[PDB]
Structure 1
Amino acid sequence: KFPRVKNWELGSITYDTLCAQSQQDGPCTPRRCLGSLVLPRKPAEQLLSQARDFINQYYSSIKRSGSQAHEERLQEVEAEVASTGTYHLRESELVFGAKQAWRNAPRCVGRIQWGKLQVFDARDCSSAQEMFTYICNHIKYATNRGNLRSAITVFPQRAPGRGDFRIWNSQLVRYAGYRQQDGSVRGDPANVEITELCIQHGWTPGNGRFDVLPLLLQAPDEAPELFVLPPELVLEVPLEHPTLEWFAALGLRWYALPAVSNMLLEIGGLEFSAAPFSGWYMSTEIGTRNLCDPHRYNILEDVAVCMDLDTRTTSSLWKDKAAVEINLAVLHSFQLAKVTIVDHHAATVSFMKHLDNEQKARGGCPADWAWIVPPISGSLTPVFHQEMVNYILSPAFRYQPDPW
């Protein structure tokens, strides 16, 4: 029926009834659970039913369901689809839709903030150059001299029989990965492919471990264009450790603004192929995943040797000890630089509060346990002991294929 949901630290029990509002299939079946997969394996009446549903959500949200404005707006959408095969959102609807998509993102531990989202309408964009302007303003607004603010910029929706607006980069700010033919990678190995694409479209590359990539922006059915971000827009933080004086000598640094730029935003059946969004980092993303993942910067050993740890055996927990100091360094360095950041304990604590708010407001909260639980110190955080139900609600952020 409805999932009985238990917190094992407190003994408390809720029931998720919100999951019944799911109109889209995830990857699981009763025969096997596929909840740990990162990516999904893969007319007019369909659009119209998604359209009416969203419009209903919207007017419900402003406490005007049934109103004259509500019924009229349904007919507008209905008349537009019947004639054209599609329709258009009003800005206020778009602002709401973007917020709900964030709110519905089962993987996001930052959703306590969902009601506080600056939404830039960039639907009047006609060129890659214009996209760059918008993106530049997004970054300036979002960065705010280190007092980070959540923001999204929405570019023109997809249209039948026309190429998409796309930002080719996976993030607005990311470091290059230069493949040296001696097998290794200088920089971020996660970005080798995007770095190569940039070079091939005429970018002159560097040879550092932290070269900020240029943007590849694509207007419909046009080759993408290359744009170098003004260095004064890309706030970065030098990494140092509060006690380990040698740590700074590693030359490590990270950027302030995390901004996902390759996800698709779906509202009322409309799809926005370019809708980059930014918030602020939770520290483990940088300290654990970006810096310690074996397929990323992979600095664990370097730090562990500097700490004179025993790298010979697993049972000395050198990896665990190194990781902790690296995350400490990130938190310290960001705090010293007055750049917004949240540690995983604060983050998960606020998410629990969010789970509680959502239970009262909607009867549940879609959450992906494997992503909510931080990459270090799992059971040391409250979300570890909290059962979670995972499902797709719309509006939603989706993955979409790389445009190349």
Structure 2
Amino acid sequence: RFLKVKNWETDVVLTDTLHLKSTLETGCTEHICMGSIVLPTKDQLFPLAKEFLDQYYSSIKRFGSKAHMDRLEEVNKEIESTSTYQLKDTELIYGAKHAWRNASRCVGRIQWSKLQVFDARDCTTAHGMFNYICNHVKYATNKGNLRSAITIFPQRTDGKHDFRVWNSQLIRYAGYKQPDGSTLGDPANVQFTEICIQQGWKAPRGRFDVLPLLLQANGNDPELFQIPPELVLEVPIRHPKFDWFKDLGLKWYGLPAVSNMLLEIGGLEFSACPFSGWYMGTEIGVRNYCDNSRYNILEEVAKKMDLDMRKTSSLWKDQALVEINIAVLYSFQSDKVTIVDHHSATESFIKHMENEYRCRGGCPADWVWIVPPMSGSITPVFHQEMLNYRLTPSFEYQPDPWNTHVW
């Protein structure tokens, strides 16, 4: 019941007491571990509110105080009367930050307390949502000096008035399937690109076309909006030693901004809560550029370096992968766009992890996601045993809107 994690590089052991407060399920059982699986009413509501308020009021050193009791009382009344309740600004900010804090798959959580929170709960329309999102993008981008932020739109009511952002990220490149059989642009974004076109987007059918926003307010039909181009910061990709790299035509956007998750706080559900931080280098160089089901550019890069691609044992893929990733970090750094390499980030997480164990009694973490997709064992997290478990407030996955939406 009091669990221990070992670092096999430093022999350091930590004791986890925090997991006892876990509520949601993992997917795993005593008979089977699903650690590598990507996706495993009023009576319901008040205990949820109370659990949340109890930790809010405990966090502000006023547990069991009049203001505490009063709030509980007050929220209990409002749930009884309204079948829901509204979070106070203070609670909203706490909840959002703690959702990030609890995100067991996120390596960048050392930053958790510095989340800029934008209360968009007064928003009523998609144009409204658009205005709020452009403001988010511009604030967070900050001319390349990125700042973490989240914008929170009205909470769910009866599930038929949901606010949803249909894009998976605020900024992503379109994907087009060619009559020639291949795929132009980002293959991960093909299906969404079709919905855009089906909703009226006129695609430029280029390779790096910034997608339009599909915004949905109050459970209404989603609307299309183009982000002001001058608000979308992009970085041309060059290599510091290889002159020819620039001719590969590669660029990436500076702002990673997840927009399809569900934020849960005290039983309330925020279905539209786009948040953003800044890139770890490998997300772009390893995953986005080198995944077979993405831009898949390894072969072309390798050819340009003139490597022996005859046998896998020349490790030409590995060589090219390093250089591709060198170029990304180099390109961003040269243009003063905030980026972090996988070494620096993982080292930060180990410090954060220790901090959490020391001050909170633990830190839920998913090793499968925390370990970077390249050079894993030369990063400290690889040798770090982690306990994975679900704490609330949380960001959750939710079904894509098109399967849900009654047009």
Fold shared per TM-score above 0.5 = yes
Displaced runs of 4 or more, over 2 A: none
Secondary structure at 2:269's aligned position in 1? Answer: strand
CA RMSD, 1 decimal: 0.8
AA matched with 2:221 = A
The Cα of 1:247 is off from its aligned counterpart by 0.4
Specify the alignment match of 1:123 in structure 2. Answer: 121
After TM superposition, the score normalised by the length of structure 1 is 0.98
CA distance in 2, matches of 1:161, 1:306: 53
After TM superposition, the score normalised by the length of structure 2 is 0.98
Is 2:215 aligned against 1:217? yes
* 291-300 or 177-186, which deviates more: 177-186
Specify the alignment match of 1:32 in structure 2. Answer: 32
Specify the alignment match of 2:405 in structure 1. Answer: none
User: Residue 297 of structure 1 is aligned with which of 272, 295, 298?
Assistant: 295
The Cα of 1:181 is off from its aligned counterpart by 2.3
The Cα of 1:344 is off from its aligned counterpart by 0.2
The Cα of 1:161 is off from its aligned counterpart by 5.2
CA distance in 1, matches of 2:4, 2:147: 36
The Cα of 1:14 is off from its aligned counterpart by 1.3
Cα-to-partner distance string for 1:42-70 (whole Å, 9 max, x where unaligned): x3222111100111111111212122211
CA distance in 1, matches of 2:159, 2:128: 22
CA distance in 2, matches of 1:254, 1:350: 24
**Could you say if the C-alpha distance between residues 161 and 240 of structure 1 is closer, same or farther in structure 2, counting changes exceeding 3 Å?**
closer
The Cα of 1:85 is off from its aligned counterpart by 1.4
Cα-to-partner distance string for 1:14-58 (whole Å, 9 max, x where unaligned): 121100000111100011100101112xx3222111100111111
Specify the alignment match of 1:84 in structure 2. Answer: 82
Give the gaps of 5 or more residues in structure 1.
none
User: Residue 199 of structure 2 is aligned with which of 177, 180, 201?
Assistant: 201
CA distance in 1, matches of 2:60, 2:343: 34
> For residues 249-398 of structure 1, what are the structure 2 equivalents within 5 Å?
249-398=247-396
CA distance in 1, matches of 2:167, 2:205: 19
AA matched with 1:312 = R
Secondary structure at 1:394's aligned position in 2? Answer: coil
Is 2:34 aligned against 1:14? no
AA matched with 2:28 = C
Cα-to-partner distance string for 1:174-203 (whole Å, 9 max, x where unaligned): 000011122211000000011111111111
**Could you say if the C-alpha distance between residues 358 and 300 of structure 1 is closer, same or farther in structure 2, counting changes exceeding 3 Å?**
same
Specify the alignment match of 1:237 in structure 2. Answer: 235
Cα-to-partner distance string for 1:244-296 (whole Å, 9 max, x where unaligned): 00001111000000000000000000000000000000000000000100000
AA matched with 1:151 = A
CA distance in 2, matches of 1:207, 1:85: 48
Is 2:184 aligned against 1:183? no
CA distance in 2, matches of 1:98, 1:353: 22
CA distance in 2, matches of 1:161, 1:107: 27
AA matched with 2:379 = T
